[PDB]
Amino acid sequence: SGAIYVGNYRVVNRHLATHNDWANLVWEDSSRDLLVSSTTAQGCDTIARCDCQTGVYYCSSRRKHYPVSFSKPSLIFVEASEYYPARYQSHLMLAVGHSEPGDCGGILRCQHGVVGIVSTGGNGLVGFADVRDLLWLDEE
Numbered sequence: 001s002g003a004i005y006v007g008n009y010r011v012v013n014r015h016l017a018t019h020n021d022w023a024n025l026v027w028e029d030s031s032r033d034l035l036v037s038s039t040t041a042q043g044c045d046t047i048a049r050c051d052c053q054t055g056v057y058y059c060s061s062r063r064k065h066y067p068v069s070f071s072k073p074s075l076i077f078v079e080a081s082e083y084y085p086a087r088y089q090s091h092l093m094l095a096v097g098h099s100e101p102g103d104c105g106g107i108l109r110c111q112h113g114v115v116g117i118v119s120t121g122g123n124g125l126v127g128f129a130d131v132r133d134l135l136w137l138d139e140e
């Protein structure tokens with residue numbers, strides 16, 4: 001579990017969104033596994049605006065932050081899971097590292113701020129839903 005809290009937005013994995021998220025919806029995209037809902041209080045996270053390929057992510061199944069090298073956001077094929085059928089998840093970055101359901105939500109961050117959240121992984125893999133192209137998260 002986990003979210004990004006930037007401005008009056010809460011960024012979560014679409015597959016983990018609650019009823020309150022859907023009832024206060026700003027934007028959602030199934031192909032990216034992302035959903036954004038509105039918040040009453042202002043958040044403290046800042047979004048990175050960059051093309052970094054090295055950063056650090058939080059792994060809840062280890063209680064640890066790990067430094068990683070990651071690929072650029074791409075259309076990577078994701079295996080059928082209980083949440084989506086086999087399809088091209090878009091805007092996805094891969095790195096070598098542990099992940100278990102449970103781990104989706106953990107933040108990946110670079111020197112500029114938050115880059116994205118955990119969304120894929122297994123066999124020493126860990127996918128990250130990028131958010132750096134969502135410029136509107138910084139305004140309204």
Ligand SMILES: C=CS(=O)(=O)N1CCC[C@H](C(N)=O)C1
Nearest residue numbers: 033078081083084119120121
């Ligand atoms: C089987 C895929 S996985 O990488 O563990 N993961 C499970 C939860 C959903 C993830 C997604 N982003 O589609 C895929």
Ligand SMILES: [Zn+2]
Nearest residue numbers: 050052110112
């Ligand atoms: Zn960066």
